[PDB]
């Protein structure tokens, strides 16, 4: 570590420092992504259990509907309407299953796999940059040297080559930063492509709720004046 | 007790039978109702656990959004859009909690308390009917008894109990028929009450179920917002292999 090496390193690293910020950010990100995969996993397992409970509940709901259908007068119409309501909830259950499936198959498992690949890709970006950077450096530590001795034996009575290699390093670093910015953004794009089908299933599941209102109104109509006999 | 009475008798028997059927059907209904309560309880318990797991997931999702938000260029916009997605999901989570609460407050617990009161009311309707039926038969027995008195004292046609006793005997027989009709009316009203109670049980159930379904229906308002945010996310993640104009500074 000399004075000439400090000056040179002060020049170079000023160029390639945004790179290290992006890289450091990516390398520090994994615990956040890991906790996400963990909590998503725990939600999906809980949704699977809820689906099983929902299906058993709907079996019992249907038995209640059947019981009304097997009474006599106006109670038979109540039963048919309860049956409709049960069928509508079964459709909602089937979409919840598809939502739960997309959550594990489209998001959790793929994000988990993508994780080790992200770590390897960031390691390599960092490694390759380090290489290009420090050979670029040592080659300009070497050209400033040649210029030093050439300037101290000419005053007893190459400079452009140093300048070349600095503009050279400027565009190297520019390209490395472009590459890191694409990888950084790309991780989120990838994550969002995985998220998309999960949210589509959620929208499809919610959309099945539109059929409940008509049935609830019918049930309301069929249960007016419970103190007297209908027609 | 002649032809007309025997006809009424069989209607009373049909009605009496129908009343006992309705009472028996009500009495045998409880295992189905109890199974429904049990399974609604089991679902509500899992929904409670789901809502906690959903909130923890959303906390993690928001940390991911924060991470993107605090990077550079277009990735910051992606973070902002992800935050909009996460906040909209907090609204869905809230509605899920409301549905879970309504399921227990409006349906499971009320239905559970209702069981014993349904049993008491059905049993009382049965006992009231038996009491009224007994009285009606007694009335028929008493008038058929007098018509036996009259009819035995009418066989003595030697005191001209024919222009005087026969009008009496005609009315005595009429009164008997009156009592049979009264029994029939008692049976018809018993059936009516039993039918009303049978239907009323399902009316009660529906009244408990409807506010639960209302909380579910309230989730329709969320859909348009998920659609818009998902279109924004798609637009923000175009050409992942390339730098967006937003990242070129």
- The conformational region for residue A229 under phi > 0 = left, psi -120 to 50 = alpha, else beta, is beta
Give the right CATH number for A1-231 from 1.10.10.10, 3.90.1150.10, 1.10.150.120, 1.20.1270.60: 1.20.1270.60
The residue of chain B nearest to residue A34, with distances taken between CA atoms, is B60
How many Å is the Cα radius of gyration of chain B? 37
Give the right CATH number for B1-249 from 1.10.10.10, 3.40.50.300, 1.20.1270.60, 3.20.20.70: 1.20.1270.60
* A41 vs A100: CA distance, rounded Å: 10
Method: X-ray
Residue B177: CB atoms within 10 A of its CB come to 16
Pick from B202, B219, B214, B218: nearest CA to B103: B214
Pick from A178, A88, A89: nearest CA to A129: A178
Nearest-CB residue to B196 (from A25, A67, A229): A229
* B118 vs B200: CA distance, rounded Å: 10
Let me know: does B110 contact B36? Beta carbons within 8 Å: no
> B203–A181: do the CB atoms touch at under 8 Å?
no
* B210 vs B233: CA distance, rounded Å: 37
Count of alpha carbons within 13 angstroms of residue B141, beta-carbon side: 6
- Distant-in-sequence, close-in-space partners of A153: CB < 8 Å, separation ≥ 6: none
> What does residue B73 show for φ and ψ, rounded to 5 degrees?
55, -135
Read off the tokens for B142.
Answer: 């008493």
Nearest-CB residue to A185 (from B35, B57, B75): B75
| Residues in chain B within 8 Å Cβ distance of A208 | none
> B61–A36: do the CB atoms touch at under 8 Å?
yes
Nearest-CB residue to A229 (from B75, B195, B219): B195
Resolution (A): 1.9
> B192–A227: do the CB atoms touch at under 8 Å?
no
CA–CA distance from B105 to each of A25, A87, A133, A209, B148 (Å)?
48, 24, 67, 22, 64
The residue of chain B nearest to residue A81, with distances taken between CA atoms, is B206
Pick from A107, A209, A196: nearest CA to B222: A209
> B57–A73: do the CB atoms touch at under 8 Å?
no
Mutation choice for A interface testing from B60, B79, B241 by most A CBs within 10 A? B60
Residue A94: CB atoms within 10 A of its CB come to 14
Nearest-CB residue to A226 (from B53, B199, B226): B199
Nearest-CB residue to B233 (from A50, A192, A220): A192
Let me know: does A14 contact A89? Beta carbons within 8 Å: no
* A145 vs A22: CA distance, rounded Å: 33
| Residues in chain A within 8 Å Cβ distance of B35 | 60, 63
The residue of chain A nearest to residue B50, with distances taken between CA atoms, is A46
Q: How many residues does chain B have?
A: 249
- The DSSP result for chain A, as a single string, is --HHHHHHHHHHHHHTTHHHHHHHHHHT-HHHHHHHHHHHHHHHHHHHHHHHHHHHHHHHHHHHHHHHHTSSSHHHHHHHHHHHHHHHHHHHHHHHHHHHHHIIIIIIHHHHHHHHHHHHHHHHHHHHHHHHHHHHHHHHHHHHHHHHHHHSSSTT--HHHHHHHHHHHHHHHHHHHHHHHHHHHHHHHHHHHHHHHHHHHHHHHHHGGGGHHHHHHHHHHHTS-TTS---
């Amino acid at each position: 570590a000399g004075h000439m090496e400090a000056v040179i390193e002060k020049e170079c690293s000023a160029l390639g420092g945004l790179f290290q910020t992006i890289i450091s950010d990516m390398k520090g990100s994994y615990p956040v992504w890991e906790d996400f995969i963990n909590k998503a996993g725990k939600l999906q397992s809980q949704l699977r259990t809820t689906v099983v409970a929902a299906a058993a509940f709907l079996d019992a709901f249907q038995k209640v509907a059947d019981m009304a259908t097997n009474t006599r007068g106006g109670t038979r119409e109540i039963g048919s309407a309860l049956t409709r309501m049960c069928m509508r909830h079964r459709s909602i259950e089937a979409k919840l299953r598809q939502f739960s499936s997309a959550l594990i198959d489209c998001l959790i498992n793929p994000l988990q796999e993508q994780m080790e690949e992200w770590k390897k890709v960031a390691n390599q970006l960092d490694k390759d940059h380090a290489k290009e950077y420090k050979k670029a450096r040592q080659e300009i530590k070497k050209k400033s040297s040649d210029t030093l001795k050439l300037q101290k034996k000419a005053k007893k009575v190459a400079l452009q080559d140093v300048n070349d290699k600095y503009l050279l390093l400027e565009e190297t670093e520019k390209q490395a930063v472009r590459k890191a910015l694409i990888e950084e953004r790309g991780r989120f794009c990838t994550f969002i492509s995985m998220l998309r089908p999960v949210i589509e299933e959620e929208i499809s599941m919610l959309g099945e709720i539109t059929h409940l209102q008509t049935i609830s109104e019918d049930l309301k109509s069929l249960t007016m004046d419970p103190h007297k006999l209908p027609s």
